[PDB]
Amino acid sequence: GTAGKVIKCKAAVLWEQKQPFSIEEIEVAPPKTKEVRIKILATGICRTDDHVIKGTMVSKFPVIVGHEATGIVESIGEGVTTVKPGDKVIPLFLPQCRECNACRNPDGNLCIRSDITGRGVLADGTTRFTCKGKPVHHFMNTSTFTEYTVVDESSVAKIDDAAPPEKVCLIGCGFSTGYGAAVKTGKVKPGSTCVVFGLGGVGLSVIMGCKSAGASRIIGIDLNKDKFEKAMAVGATECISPKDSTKPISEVLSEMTGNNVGYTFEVIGHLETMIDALASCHMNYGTSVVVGVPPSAKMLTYDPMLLFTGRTWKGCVFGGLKSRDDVPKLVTEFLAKKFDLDQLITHVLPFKKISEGFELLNSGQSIRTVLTF
Amino acid sequence: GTAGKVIKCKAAVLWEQKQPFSIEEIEVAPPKTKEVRIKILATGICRTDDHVIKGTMVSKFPVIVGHEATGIVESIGEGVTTVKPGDKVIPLFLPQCRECNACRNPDGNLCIRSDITGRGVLADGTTRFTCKGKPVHHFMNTSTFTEYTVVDESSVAKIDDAAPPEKVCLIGCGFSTGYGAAVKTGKVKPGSTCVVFGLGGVGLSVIMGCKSAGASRIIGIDLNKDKFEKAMAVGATECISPKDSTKPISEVLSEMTGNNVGYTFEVIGHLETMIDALASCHMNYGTSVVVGVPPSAKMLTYDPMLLFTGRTWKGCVFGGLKSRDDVPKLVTEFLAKKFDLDQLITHVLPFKKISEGFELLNSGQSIRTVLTF
Amino acid sequence: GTAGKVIKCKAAVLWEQKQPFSIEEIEVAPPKTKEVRIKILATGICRTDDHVIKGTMVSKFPVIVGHEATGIVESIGEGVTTVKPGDKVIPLFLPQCRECNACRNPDGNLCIRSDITGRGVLADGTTRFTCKGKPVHHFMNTSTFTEYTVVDESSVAKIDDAAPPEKVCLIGCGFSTGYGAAVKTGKVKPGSTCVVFGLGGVGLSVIMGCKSAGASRIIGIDLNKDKFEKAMAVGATECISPKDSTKPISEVLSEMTGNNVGYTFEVIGHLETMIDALASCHMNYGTSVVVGVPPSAKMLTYDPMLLFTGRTWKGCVFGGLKSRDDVPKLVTEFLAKKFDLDQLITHVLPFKKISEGFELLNSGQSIRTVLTF
Amino acid sequence: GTAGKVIKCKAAVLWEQKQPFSIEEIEVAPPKTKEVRIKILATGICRTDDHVIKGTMVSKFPVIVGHEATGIVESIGEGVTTVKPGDKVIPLFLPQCRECNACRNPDGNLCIRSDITGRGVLADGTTRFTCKGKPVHHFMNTSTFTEYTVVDESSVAKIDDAAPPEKVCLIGCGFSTGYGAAVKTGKVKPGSTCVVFGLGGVGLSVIMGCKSAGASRIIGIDLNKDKFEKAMAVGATECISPKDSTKPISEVLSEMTGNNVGYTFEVIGHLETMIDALASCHMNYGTSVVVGVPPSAKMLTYDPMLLFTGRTWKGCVFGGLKSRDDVPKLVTEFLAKKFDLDQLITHVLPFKKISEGFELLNSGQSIRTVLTF
Numbered sequence A, B, C, D: 001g002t003a004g005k006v007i008k009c010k011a012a013v014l015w016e017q018k019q020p021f022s023i024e025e026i027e028v029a030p031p032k033t034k035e036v037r038i039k040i041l042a043t044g045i046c047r048t049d050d051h052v053i054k055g056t057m058v059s060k061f062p063v064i065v066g067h068e069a070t071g072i073v074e075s076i077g078e079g080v081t082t083v084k085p086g087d088k089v090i091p092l093f094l095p096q097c098r099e100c101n102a103c104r105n106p107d108g109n110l111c112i113r114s115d116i117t118g119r120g121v122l123a124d125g126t127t128r129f130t131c132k133g134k135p136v137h138h139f140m141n142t143s144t145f146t147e148y149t150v151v152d153e154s155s156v157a158k159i160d161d162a163a164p165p166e167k168v169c170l171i172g173c174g175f176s177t178g179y180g181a182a183v184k185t186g187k188v189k190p191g192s193t194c195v196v197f198g199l200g201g202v203g204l205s206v207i208m209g210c211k212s213a214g215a216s217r218i219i220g221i222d223l224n225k226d227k228f229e230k231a232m233a234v235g236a237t238e239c240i241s242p243k244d245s246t247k248p249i250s251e252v253l254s255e256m257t258g259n260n261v262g263y264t265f266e267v268i269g270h271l272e273t274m275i276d277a278l279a280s281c282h283m284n285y286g287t288s289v290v291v292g293v294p295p296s297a298k299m300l301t302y303d304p305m306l307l308f309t310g311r312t313w314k315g316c317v318f319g320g321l322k323s324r325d326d327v328p329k330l331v332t333e334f335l336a337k338k339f340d341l342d343q344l345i346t347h348v349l350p351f352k353k354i355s356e357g358f359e360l361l362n363s364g365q366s367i368r369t370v371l372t373f
């Protein structure tokens, strides 16, 4: 009965920077050509969502953040072919137009439609959200902290009907990012020695990926020792903290492996720890993968000799996945009991408790928090 | 015979930094255990040698430089098994002891015996040169600006007897580095687009590597437009200079290619161009290889965001070659007519005209000058 | 912690003879009085371990083989006084209780505690391993193809901490055996002419021993001519194959040396070659050392006149070394670069690739393959 | 004079095997170049001579046996420089030409001129004896069961004129063999425990040798207990017989010494007891010397594991003595009263009674029986 009509629903709106959410009553426009309106079933709280709140990430306001989620297709726009009302799907912050260079290349995944600049809009350059007359912006081609959202078709992944929305939502960000980091970006090898900087939802996902890649050793690092128990239990053959010693973490790690660190992953978001992760992989054959999003407008300064000796330094976006291709496959892999997401979800709460949720994340008391509708 | 005795010969000595070469009469101690004394037949003037003079490369003094050469074995020390007197060889600055992690690693090449710290001695920590009752240091496990030198066996490659020493000496640094940079370090896929920053002896070699890789486009970049004719002769599809436009080189290249720069190579040695090279490759699926040697003790400041999107940034030592295995294979490939080295040799002069060789190097009027004995 | 507790870990188990390994999850009991639980860091693949598989060496089943290794002391049992947790150690397949006759005799080394009969248990007659509720047998007082093992204190050699595990593990069997076979058992004298039958890990170590002793001539013998290059490199003066001539190898050797073969060494494990080795040393003043292990339950038949004329024929266990006395000394000698172990190691692979190590051995492609944990 | 003329005398000839002696009239040709004709004063009856009669030793017929003797030089052939007519000498069945590997090598003694193949001729391939027209063959470079014999100068030891020929004749075989077996071949050590298999003439000499080495225990073994009284008188500390118990002799011996049998000597001539002798010495640090002579054309089958554990097994020819150097010295030591030979001679008879001497040998009634002229 709503298809074609504006949908009045609620949404955690953010009117300005460094402000708390405001659960407003908003109006969601119907989907235009090649767009899709989705009803969010569950959505997790990712650390990147907090970046906007903190103001460590450029964004227009007002805006509805949230990007990690599972939903149902309420209605499809004109010309859509990959989905139909009733289909279970997962909104993709990383699209796959399949037409641009990065999409045409098997070794690329950052679609030209990727909202990196903080555009806060869809393909045609407009918004679909209105609240109190004034228009509300989108977040990374998704916007999930709402009962309903509209994303372009190029940002819709049709998944298996039987998939549990409250768990598979991690495939929309957190999990796929860390797992694919190892498996598809760093391409960790069997017998390797990996080092993961940061033991959050993504960090812990990298571990699973490395352990699954065959790494005979996986060392976890975190200032928060409370994250160790989770680490060891996930695949960390050990875990330490930078504060445990005064000698550079790079030296410590070398000594621990006898200078044979094949991979280092930065999954925090600190420039200082990016240098640390680089310096910690082997000087000639080590690879350092940066997964953590660095704070906007900050220049990095390091010793270029660290790179000259042969080191490989690369970035990662959504764990190197080709969204529309890989997401539905990973879902089937979860159904086939291959991976246990449950280890990652430390809290399931009703959407209304969103404020409490963000509190948890920021206190170091939680991995993932899944909000329910 | 000369075997077992100290050899008196002439060598181009550098008594201190920022001073011309002094062609002194020196004493070359005989080869100890697993060492090899070599008679130099032909040696190339490489830019890195100039770094010692200019003072931008750490080195002890006095010292004898030169590291690109072809020689003949005069006498082997005790225990030597890979070479015998009269054998044609190429001394190696990048050793291959076959037993350290890097040598054992199929993805490594920086042997632990590499003199990266400017020690200026052999494996046992001593020198073999003397001049006026003063010990003269070695340079990067080689020292070829001399009638005779002594290296460790791990630093000797036995090559085909019929190899013209005045041509294949480039296989000791110049040509191997460039060619390998493209084929081994960068793994240039066929049909891709490559951009090379710097059209000197190594830069031109990189063009040959990309050309051997099947690249559909290879764009040369140099401030000296006189280098352009050569670049085109060895395989460049077109050449340009940064001064030709006011907009950033990264944007000029993106526009020229439709946002498709597969691989960039920094073949100059300026941190400035290292960032330009990084920034000039596709933001998500591009690879930038640092071939140029950055000036001593200089930190590099760049925008981390260039990396995070997915760019791969990696160093390169000797073209990623495992010295003792690859050098012989390259000489065989030269004799098998797989490539031309004549194009890179602009001048062939007697060893005594070494200062002119350096003049032509610095005045930009020479790719490779080869000094003969 | 793990002290006093059962350890769950992985181990390559053999359930019956003529079967491939089965990496299984096993439990390792804590150490009882005067025993020591050790974590394995690196372990070699010695041909003896292959005899168990092939069934040419008696063993009870199931069993965990492997015996050439380096480790770190996880925990010590009651009354232990020679090692402490943290200590680096080499487990000893040849004990040294220091109380028995062979231990008190300066010319003996086969301690009563040696497991030569396939006992597969510790000094108190019991096992320390369980897998699927059923007890698993030890191998030659060691058992190292497991993450953890328990040995009697009489079978632990505390070594230098700075010792690289993946190198000094050969001092646990292979190197010490062939080396001591020349220096300690055969007592090769300066100027002699030695002959080695078999050029694998042990054979190559014999040649190093002969050279170290002062042999003027070392002849290598092997069907696999691909082994010649390394035999020559390590010390040989020439190598040949039994197939090169139709006349008995003894005659050939007589002819090459003009009937002056002082020492022959059988480092293979064939009754046939044991005889060949005997008949090849001088008929009156020759010495023939048997290093290779004869297939179990096979009687030897030879011409006694070979012996009567004066030939000395003697067996050899662990190169004649007194375990806890000579092992620690060899590690220290190694650290002083007295001998090269890396020449013997042709492959380093992660433990999980155990079959490939064995396949490489059996296909004639490796000397020593070292497995890392 | 007789010098230069054929000498007619008597000799004990064997026309064929398994037939008693025949005292015939024979012709002894004059000594050719580098040969010596000797008058036999006294000669012992060695068990080896009986081997020829029994047919368990290869020989041509007819032949004149006997090899243990003392004599006087009748005439010297052309070129002879070491002895003159009238000199007292001992014919050597083991030559010392001083120009062959064994001879020149300090550890060898089996000269190249030794008659091991059972030729029965002198260096030049001819005989010197004639009887009833037909030529009679020599035995082991000696032939002493005759009044006159001719030997090569390499088989002649000039000894002290004051030496009792009826006692020192044992130094031509029996005594020197047994004595040297312990002192020179086995190299028995002070305080060791030796076991001698066979209490005959050579066995008793081994005991004497072991007693001079400082042995602490010397256990004698024989099936004939009447030999025990003499064994104890020459040095044995106890004696036993294989039939004294049912358990294997090796266990009996082990039990008696607490598994500490340093040396075993076989001085009987059986393959079975040679095996018993090996198995009887300490499995790791024991040495078993084979002195007895094994019946020709018989293969020995034993368990190689007996040898593998470390036992040293060696043969013995004439107690390992360099005949021309050692025989004189031994006589000199006898005259210096180092040992008593009288204990070994149980019967002194005239040469015509040779048959009785042999009867007493094969009945067990005598140790050595000396025949006089």
Ligand SMILES: NC(=O)c1ccc[n+]([C@@H]2O[C@H](COP(=O)([O-])OP(=O)(O)OC[C@H]3O[C@@H](n4cnc5c(N)ncnc54)[C@H](O)[C@@H]3O)[C@@H](O)[C@H]2O)c1
Pocket: A046, A047, A048, A051, A173, A174, A177, A197, A198, A199, A200, A201, A202, A203, A221, A222, A223, A224, A227, A242, A267, A268, A269, A270, A273, A290, A291, A292, A293, A294, A316, A317, A318, A319, A364, A367
């Ligand atoms: N690249 C992308 O595709 C992508 C995807 C998802 C998330 N992210 C980014 O990855 C990073 C983490 O994601 P998350 O959900 O796992 O965050 P998270 O907050 O749950 O985990 C952060 C971890 O870093 C640890 N940490 C902080 N400072 C530390 C330090 N100095 N040294 C060691 N550990 C320290 C914290 O204790 C915590 O364990 C953030 O920058 C996020 O924006 C990026």
Ligand SMILES: NC(=O)c1ccc[n+]([C@@H]2O[C@H](COP(=O)([O-])OP(=O)(O)OC[C@H]3O[C@@H](n4cnc5c(N)ncnc54)[C@H](O)[C@@H]3O)[C@@H](O)[C@H]2O)c1
Pocket: B046, B047, B048, B051, B173, B174, B177, B197, B198, B199, B200, B201, B202, B203, B221, B222, B223, B224, B227, B267, B268, B269, B270, B273, B290, B291, B292, B293, B294, B316, B317, B318, B319, B361, B364, B366, B367
């Ligand atoms: N990685 C190694 O293994 C290795 C091996 C060989 C040489 N090198 C280094 O590689 C670099 C080049 O070697 P080369 O012998 O070919 O030097 P070269 O002097 O012949 O070439 C340098 C080129 O760079 C050009 N150039 C300089 N500044 C420029 C700028 N700002 N922009 C564009 N072009 C500019 C010059 O005109 C010249 O053509 C040096 O740093 C040398 O030390 C490294």
Ligand SMILES: NC(=O)c1ccc[n+]([C@@H]2O[C@H](COP(=O)([O-])OP(=O)(O)OC[C@H]3O[C@@H](n4cnc5c(N)ncnc54)[C@H](O)[C@@H]3O)[C@@H](O)[C@H]2O)c1
Pocket: C046, C047, C048, C051, C173, C174, C177, C197, C198, C199, C200, C201, C202, C203, C221, C222, C223, C224, C227, C242, C267, C268, C269, C270, C273, C290, C291, C292, C293, C294, C316, C317, C318, C319, C364, C366, C367
């Ligand atoms: N005595 C002990 O203390 C002790 C110690 C270690 C090893 N071993 C024994 O030593 C022997 C060899 O061990 P390894 O570790 O050196 O093994 P290995 O397999 O690496 O070497 C065997 C070598 O002998 C060669 N060979 C095989 N058949 C041949 C033949 N018919 N004639 C000539 N050469 C032939 C093989 O090609 C190979 O080169 C084995 O029996 C092993 O059990 C004994």
Ligand SMILES: NC(=O)c1ccc[n+]([C@@H]2O[C@H](COP(=O)([O-])OP(=O)(O)OC[C@H]3O[C@@H](n4cnc5c(N)ncnc54)[C@H](O)[C@@H]3O)[C@@H](O)[C@H]2O)c1
Pocket: D046, D047, D048, D051, D173, D174, D177, D197, D198, D199, D200, D201, D202, D203, D221, D222, D223, D224, D227, D242, D267, D268, D269, D270, D273, D290, D291, D292, D293, D294, D316, D317, D318, D319, D364, D367
């Ligand atoms: N190697 C040489 O240089 C050399 C020198 C002299 C003698 N021999 C040989 O040495 C051996 C001994 O010579 P001998 O002159 O002293 O002989 P012998 O006949 O006097 O003594 C043999 C002894 O062995 C004992 N015996 C035989 N079978 C027995 C058995 N099964 N178990 C235990 N005892 C048994 C006999 O009772 C006798 O006491 C002979 O074979 C002889 O040919 C060798």
Ligand SMILES: C[As](C)(=O)[O-]
Pocket: none
């Ligand atoms: C069960 As069964 C034949 O291995 O004893």
Ligand SMILES: C[As](C)(=O)[O-]
Pocket: C015, C060, C061, C062
């Ligand atoms: C010795 As079984 C466990 O194979 O019967």
Ligand SMILES: C[As](C)(=O)[O-]
Pocket: C016, C061
């Ligand atoms: C034949 As079985 C040792 O497995 O019982």
Ligand SMILES: C[As](C)(=O)[O-]
Pocket: C100, C101, C102, C112, D258, D259, D260
């Ligand atoms: C008798 As014993 C324990 O030394 O072999």
Ligand SMILES: C[As](C)(=O)[O-]
Pocket: D232, D233, D234, D235, D236, D237
């Ligand atoms: C004659 As005695 C050495 O046995 O006492």
Ligand SMILES: [Zn+2]
Pocket: A046, A047, A048, A049, A067, A068, A173, A174
């Ligand atoms: Zn996210």
Ligand SMILES: [Zn+2]
Pocket: A095, A096, A097, A098, A099, A100, A101, A102, A103, A110, A111, A112, A113
């Ligand atoms: Zn796209």
Ligand SMILES: [Zn+2]
Pocket: A270
């Ligand atoms: Zn932090």
Ligand SMILES: [Zn+2]
Pocket: B095, B096, B097, B098, B099, B100, B101, B102, B103, B104, B110, B111, B112, B113
């Ligand atoms: Zn190396």
Ligand SMILES: [Zn+2]
Pocket: B060, B135, B137
């Ligand atoms: Zn100096």
Ligand SMILES: [Zn+2]
Pocket: B046, B047, B048, B049, B067, B068, B173, B174
């Ligand atoms: Zn160079």
Ligand SMILES: [Zn+2]
Pocket: B268, B270
């Ligand atoms: Zn420049």
